Design a protein around this ligand. Sequence first.
Ligand SMILES: [Mg+2]
Ligand SMILES: [Mg+2]
Ligand SMILES: [Mg+2]
Ligand SMILES: [Mg+2]
Ligand SMILES: [Mg+2]
Ligand SMILES: [Mg+2]
Ligand SMILES: [Mg+2]
Ligand SMILES: [Mg+2]
Ligand SMILES: [Mg+2]
Ligand SMILES: [Mg+2]
Ligand SMILES: [Mg+2]
Ligand SMILES: [Mg+2]
Ligand SMILES: [Mg+2]
Ligand SMILES: [Mg+2]
Ligand SMILES: [Mg+2]
Ligand SMILES: [Mg+2]
Ligand SMILES: [Mg+2]
Ligand SMILES: [Mg+2]
Ligand SMILES: [Mg+2]
Ligand SMILES: [Mg+2]
Ligand SMILES: [Mg+2]
Ligand SMILES: [Mg+2]
Ligand SMILES: [Mg+2]
Ligand SMILES: [Mg+2]
Ligand SMILES: [Mg+2]
Ligand SMILES: [Mg+2]
Ligand SMILES: [Mg+2]
Ligand SMILES: [Mg+2]
Ligand SMILES: [Mg+2]
Ligand SMILES: [Mg+2]
Ligand SMILES: [Mg+2]
Ligand SMILES: [Mg+2]
Ligand SMILES: [Mg+2]
Ligand SMILES: [Mg+2]
Ligand SMILES: [Mg+2]
Ligand SMILES: [Mg+2]
Ligand SMILES: [Mg+2]
Ligand SMILES: [Mg+2]
Ligand SMILES: [Mg+2]
Ligand SMILES: [Mg+2]
Ligand SMILES: [Mg+2]
Lengths: 156, 208, 225
Amino acid sequence: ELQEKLIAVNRVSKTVKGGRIFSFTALTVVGDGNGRVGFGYGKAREVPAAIQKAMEKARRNMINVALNNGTLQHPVKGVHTGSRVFMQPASEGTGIIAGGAMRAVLEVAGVHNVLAKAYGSTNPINVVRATIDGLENMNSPEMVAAKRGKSVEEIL
Amino acid sequence: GQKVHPNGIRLGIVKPWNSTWFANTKEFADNLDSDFKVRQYLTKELAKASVSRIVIERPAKSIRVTIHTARPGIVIGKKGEDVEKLRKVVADIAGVPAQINIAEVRKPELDAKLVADSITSQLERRVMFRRAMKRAVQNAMRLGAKGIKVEVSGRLGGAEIARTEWYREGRVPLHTLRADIDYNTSEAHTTYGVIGVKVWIFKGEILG
Amino acid sequence: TVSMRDMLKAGVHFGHQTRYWNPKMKPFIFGARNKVHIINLEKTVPMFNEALAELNKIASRKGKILFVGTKRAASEAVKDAALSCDQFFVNHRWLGGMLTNWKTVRQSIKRLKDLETQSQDGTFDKLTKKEALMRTRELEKLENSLGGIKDMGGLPDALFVIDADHEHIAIKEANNLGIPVFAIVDTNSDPDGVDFVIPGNDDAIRAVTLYLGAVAATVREGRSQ
RNA sequence: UUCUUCUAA
RNA sequence: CUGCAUGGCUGUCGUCAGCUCGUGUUGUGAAAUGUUGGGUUAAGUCCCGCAACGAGCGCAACCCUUAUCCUUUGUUGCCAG
RNA sequence: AAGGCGGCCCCCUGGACGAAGACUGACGCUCAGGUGCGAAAGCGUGGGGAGCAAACAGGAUUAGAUACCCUGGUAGUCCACGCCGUAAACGAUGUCGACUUGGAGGUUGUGCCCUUGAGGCGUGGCUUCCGGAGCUAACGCGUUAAGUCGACCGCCUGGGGA
RNA sequence: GGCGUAAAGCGCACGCAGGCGGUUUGUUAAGUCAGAUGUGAAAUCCCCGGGCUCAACCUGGGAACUGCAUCUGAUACUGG
Ligand SMILES: [Mg+2]
Ligand SMILES: [Mg+2]
Ligand SMILES: [Mg+2]
Ligand SMILES: [Mg+2]
Ligand SMILES: [Mg+2]
Ligand SMILES: [Mg+2]
Ligand SMILES: [Mg+2]
Ligand SMILES: [Mg+2]
Ligand SMILES: [Mg+2]
Ligand SMILES: [Mg+2]
Ligand SMILES: [Mg+2]
Ligand SMILES: [Mg+2]
Ligand SMILES: [Mg+2]
Ligand SMILES: [Mg+2]
Ligand SMILES: [Mg+2]
Ligand SMILES: [Mg+2]
Ligand SMILES: [Mg+2]
Ligand SMILES: [Mg+2]
Ligand SMILES: [Mg+2]
Ligand SMILES: [Mg+2]
Ligand SMILES: [Mg+2]
Ligand SMILES: [Mg+2]
Ligand SMILES: [Mg+2]
Ligand SMILES: [Mg+2]
Ligand SMILES: [Mg+2]
Ligand SMILES: [Mg+2]
Ligand SMILES: [Mg+2]
Ligand SMILES: [Mg+2]
Ligand SMILES: [Mg+2]
Ligand SMILES: [Mg+2]
Ligand SMILES: [Mg+2]
Ligand SMILES: [Mg+2]
Ligand SMILES: [Mg+2]
Ligand SMILES: [Mg+2]
Ligand SMILES: [Mg+2]
Ligand SMILES: [Mg+2]
Ligand SMILES: [Mg+2]
Ligand SMILES: [Mg+2]
Ligand SMILES: [Mg+2]
Ligand SMILES: [Mg+2]
Ligand SMILES: [Mg+2]
């Protein structure tokens, strides 16, 4: 029931006395089609072993996102280390308008109507951190009502 | 050429010889040719049979060939049909009266010659070599081997740069002399070349 | 359940000097006498009694409790308190990943049982006597580390810590697993990783016996209910 | 005490 | 003919004490930790310490030979009585 | 203010800071162009010239040695007055103001406690080291910010070519 | 968007023009804000329609033309 997407696989290296040792890294993100989103980053000597370590860590450390109907709730920004990221709630049925690694994380997030733009470095590890950081501090009309101590209707 | 052959180093300790007979120097090398020709013939003839270890023994100028196989049904056929066919051609080759005994191989996933030939048969019909090495290791550790190491070598998937790969699960102590390392080796004659397969299987330590 | 002059006689208000204190402990320090901070016992009592209520809440539904202190002065006291209310203790060094990497330590819990089975119960004398001492010092080492949790089987449900910075590894493993944390948070410690913060001294042997007996009561009182 | 340099894929 | 398409086999660094993995943790990451430190050893040998806990390949032992004794069997070997 | 400043004494002289008051009443901040200052080396004129020392000479060293090493040695270094206006002129961090957890110091005032000792309790200036949040590509920075903001200025736009 | 180390803080400072400016009251209405009027050609673009067998195209009505001027206000902020 948790849909699983790998974003990018990558071969890294490590030089020792014998020569170059190669290894593989895998960046996967999971989600339930609702606010539960979580990503993972695994690494092993082999590509099917690396995605499995990535899927394992992604299933725990999930994060909860207060969605709207099928879209976001207010235009929120998220940064991580190279990637200031803008994303925006959008009208019904405009699709996921998002780039690369950001497309995979919002699709398992269960949103369906976004207007996104990834500024800065578009390295897939940091931009998937920047959207999760961007989606986590997005707050609901309920959350701002309990915080400010008003009703939802006084906020409109 | 770093590693000693694990069968040949254990032959006085935990492994038996595949030929246990005696002759003087006058009649030695003729027997060793005679042992070679029947292992040549039976391997070509019982290729579809999953034969592992052909043990040859000759008392009183009469050869006794003990065939180890995973299924004796294809070796026998009808009751005295193919064994009797194979017994009369051994006597033509050995020049002495022959006798064929069949010792059944319980658990064929825990026998190195059967496992190496299973990898070779899979590689010959063009399967992914890494998938073949996983299933050879998973079946043996499930069936109860204390440790298996398999290894293929050279021209894998038709790549022009030949390399070797090996998997290992469980402990395979090669330097331990009392270790029951079942070792044997096969060769796959693919369309891109020859792929050599080695497989070590550790059953446990004989405490003699 | 513990009055203020109980705390005042044992030495709960004592702490460490003014060159070791954490600025996060500002709502808990009363003053500073003889270049040593003084813990505000006005806020110690209603928070420690709020913590013992949750112990009575969690041990009601048969939760597992782990006592964590390896100060090598309060090592025997944290063992005797855990054997009163027959709960679990860590008196020698908290292994890195004892909670998060439980599935590897589990493979040493089983080893601890088999070494206790083979030598004591199995009576496996007359082996190679240097290995017979290697079996002995293996079982001695594993009991010294994992003997306090050898009957626990699963993750505990609440964690009681003697020092919030000396046992900071156990705080982080509990923070990952969502397990609530009970700790004597002194002035030189960090009060953020502890879910129910209890101010108080850490080096006072009288206070250690004072802290644990109030816990060893409310577990036994919580067990029968 | 002095103690330089090494192309090809 | 091509060892620069290969299998097999071999030299070599080097009988040098190293080389790695699982899970955990640290780092955005390449990676790190483990494997470092205090001692000690022929040895990642062992002990203690330690965010590591474990495991594997090796380092050792199991093998052969030699060095003393015992029992058994004494010819084609032996000669004290 | 920066460059920079080191025996001692006098004369002339700038700035900072502190303690209490008194007073003026926004008089402030920044600054293109402009002007001034600005290490050493160098230049001009006039002195001075112990030591040091480019250049140069000799000796070694070396395959060579226009070098390092040695023995010498001239501008120069010093003073007066001009000029040059540059340095890795660096904290590689423009100035001014506000706010934001701490620790160990150095230095320099000043209040208080019986100075019952060089102590005890404070309160200002300047400064060094470590470090939290936060920030940062990381290294690190971290109340003297590279944190959170405001005002103004200078500057950047691939590496060469330059 | 940047400028410790990747390109990037003038060597430092004074300072004219310029930019900016604590706090309180009054006044002004310049900025600002609101309304109205005049204008912002038509076409084009957009919206709702209509017409060519549909579409391209043609076309009716509207919105828009984010501007400027004048007048009537508003006085928190900025200016005087
Ligand atoms: Mg870029
Ligand atoms: Mg060899
Ligand atoms: Mg040359
Ligand atoms: Mg070769
Ligand atoms: Mg070869
Ligand atoms: Mg050759
Ligand atoms: Mg070629
Ligand atoms: Mg690891
Ligand atoms: Mg991580
Ligand atoms: Mg190593
Ligand atoms: Mg390492
Ligand atoms: Mg050591
Ligand atoms: Mg070892
Ligand atoms: Mg006045
Ligand atoms: Mg100025
Ligand atoms: Mg000069
Ligand atoms: Mg000249
Ligand atoms: Mg001159
Ligand atoms: Mg002169
Ligand atoms: Mg002279
Ligand atoms: Mg000289
Ligand atoms: Mg310059
Ligand atoms: Mg300087
Ligand atoms: Mg300096
Ligand atoms: Mg500069
Ligand atoms: Mg610092
Ligand atoms: Mg910033
Ligand atoms: Mg700043
Ligand atoms: Mg910066
Ligand atoms: Mg840029
Ligand atoms: Mg540079
Ligand atoms: Mg630069
Ligand atoms: Mg500067
Ligand atoms: Mg200027
Ligand atoms: Mg004003
Ligand atoms: Mg006004
Ligand atoms: Mg006006
Ligand atoms: Mg108007
Ligand atoms: Mg129509
Ligand atoms: Mg028009
Ligand atoms: Mg005004």
